[PDB]
Ligand binder design. Sequence first.
Ligand code: HEM
Ligand code: HEM
Ligand code: HEM
Ligand code: HEM
Ligand code: DG2
Lengths: 145, 145, 141, 141
Amino acid sequence: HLTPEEKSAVTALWGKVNVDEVGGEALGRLLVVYPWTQRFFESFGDLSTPDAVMGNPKVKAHGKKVLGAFSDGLAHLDNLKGTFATLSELHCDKLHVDPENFRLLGNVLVCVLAHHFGKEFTPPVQAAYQKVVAGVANALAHKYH
Amino acid sequence: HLTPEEKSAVTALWGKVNVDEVGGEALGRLLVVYPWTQRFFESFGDLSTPDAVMGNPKVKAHGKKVLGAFSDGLAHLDNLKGTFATLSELHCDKLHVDPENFRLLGNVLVCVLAHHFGKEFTPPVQAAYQKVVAGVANALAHKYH
Amino acid sequence: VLSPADKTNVKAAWGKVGAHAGEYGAEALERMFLSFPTTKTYFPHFDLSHGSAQVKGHGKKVADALTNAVAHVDDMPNALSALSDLHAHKLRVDPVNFKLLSHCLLVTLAAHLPAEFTPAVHASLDKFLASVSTVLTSKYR
Amino acid sequence: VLSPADKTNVKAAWGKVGAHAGEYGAEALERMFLSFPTTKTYFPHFDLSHGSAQVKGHGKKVADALTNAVAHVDDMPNALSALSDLHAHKLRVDPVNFKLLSHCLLVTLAAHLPAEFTPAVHASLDKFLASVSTVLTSKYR
Ligand code: HEM
Ligand code: HEM
Ligand code: HEM
Ligand code: HEM
Ligand SMILES: O=C(O)[C@@H](COP(=O)(O)O)OP(=O)(O)O
């Protein structure tokens, strides 16, 4: 998957991330750019407009939890399958969440990281993160049956 | 992965396959159903209508070598990557073929297996072949950089 | 866009489906749940076992929408508007799934139409299923 | 479709692209080649190294076409008629690839427009580029 220079650059950039704000903002953007994804959160309240979504505390709170697990996954870049196995079985058997949502969240995350770091989210850094979000998507999807 | 029953269903169905024939039939149909794939065969001559494709002798001669390699891979289900390693290198470095073509041919191939075998290509037999064609395709896209 | 030969082809193939549309609809769904297990995340309320009544009933509705699309093949955005709304606003099935079902419907037809599933008809049905899908997701955002 | 709002959003972000379009296209392309290597199969005739001249030129060409598209948002099928004939009849790039360049174009914009890349605008740009991609592949079969 990642070369060692890629592993390094990812860790390097992650350590400057405020996982709380980035998670809220990513899930927020997910619900706004791909509205059908709101289907899993009707109990979150007002998701009627973009600021209503980005401002929604349940969206923000779920975003933080989700990106937290993701973040914890960045310490398992050698066996993401193993680290998300439980969360994968959960998202399938219990939450009935279509894995494509994990890929859509992945790209929104990449756009958020780019938006936050500007110039520093270099083409090479992005390439490394594309490998990671694709790995986390596949790992999360690994157990669906 | 395939379960020992899926491997059996696959090998047994493949034993009934005229490989040269299925090869010409799947390549031809890929070129008719997704005509943009004809971009790699300007040297094959006339590809203007469905019959001009299906009956083109260069398209038939080529389907033969393509499904022949595919057929060999089926005798190596536990090691598709190594089996297809040198053809992966060639399709990337020399022919410059986008791997998405391998997935489109995988699906056309499943359609040709169902059309030929009729009821005998049962939904459980199809699931087994879906894993095989996705496997070949991932195996042929592996050496791309 | 569907050409005159495309429509002739769809109509010929679908015409031969005839009274079996419901059954074929159900078989394509089973092929899909079996081949693409992630698609089952949209039916947690269905007993999905072979031959279930829920799946049988749903296949008939899917095949009936398609039979309608063929009858109104030159006016699909309108003939499918209600269904399109249903999918964009409530079901919200992610778009990548229509291709999976479309593939399983083509496989189901191939399996059943030895004489009619020619390279040409296969090309036209694919374009048709792709067009029905685009209409059904056209209002997603 | 693109709403009257999506159009106002697209014009504003793109207006802010200024004489930078060439550099951002080239950047979008470099990001795409590096992140999704299978896209390089379409340019075995380009030097694809960083700061490569052909990439810089193609980048400008791609940007200018979008700039023309933004200016003709209401009527893109037409503004892009010739470029869609070109991708459908000669280049024949597989459709899976347009979503990859589009993503890369958004990452590029976000990385350069912190002020303007709001959630809503991110939404509109995404719809716009998929709409462009759709026109570009509408004549493929
Ligand atoms: C990016 C990979 C993702 C990770 C790392 C992740 C992780 C998590 C975690 C930590 C939980 C709580 C599990 C527990 O009960 O202990 C969860 C729940 C959930 N996730 Fe995921 N998730 C991801 C993406 C998604 C996406 C994209 C959607 C759909 C838009 C989604 C929908 C849900 C739902 C609905 C729940 C339950 C919500 C609730 O009960 O309030 N997840 N996720
Ligand atoms: C199951 C997938 C595939 C297999 C097993 C396969 C295998 C082969 C074989 C064994 C060769 C001959 C290699 C040589 O000439 O040294 C070949 C050549 C070639 N393949 Fe593939 N192939 C696959 C699918 C594809 C697809 C999907 C296309 C493109 C639509 C493609 C395009 C070509 C081309 C352009 C050549 C060279 C033809 C020529 O000599 O003019 N292949 N392939
Ligand atoms: C050929 C494309 C499709 C057509 C023509 C179509 C047609 C239909 C129709 C006619 C209904 C019944 C509406 C009613 O009850 O009034 C429906 C509902 C539904 N469809 Fe779609 N559908 C298609 C693809 C999809 C796909 C790809 C999936 C998911 C993988 C999906 C998921 C569902 C579900 C979850 C329902 C609710 C069924 C229930 O609870 O009974 N559909 N669709
Ligand atoms: C946002 C969608 C796209 C836009 C607006 C766009 C724009 C253009 C333009 C303006 C040309 C120049 C043609 C001329 O000089 O007459 C062209 C060429 C070309 N495009 Fe597209 N394109 C898009 C996506 C794609 C994709 C996704 C690929 C590949 C992954 C691609 C690959 C090509 C290639 C290889 C050429 C030939 C370039 C050369 O020989 O120098 N295009 N495109
Ligand atoms: O890592 C690998 O060598 C293979 C094994 O898994 P599959 O290809 O079967 O998913 O791919 P990856 O884990 O990246 O998805």
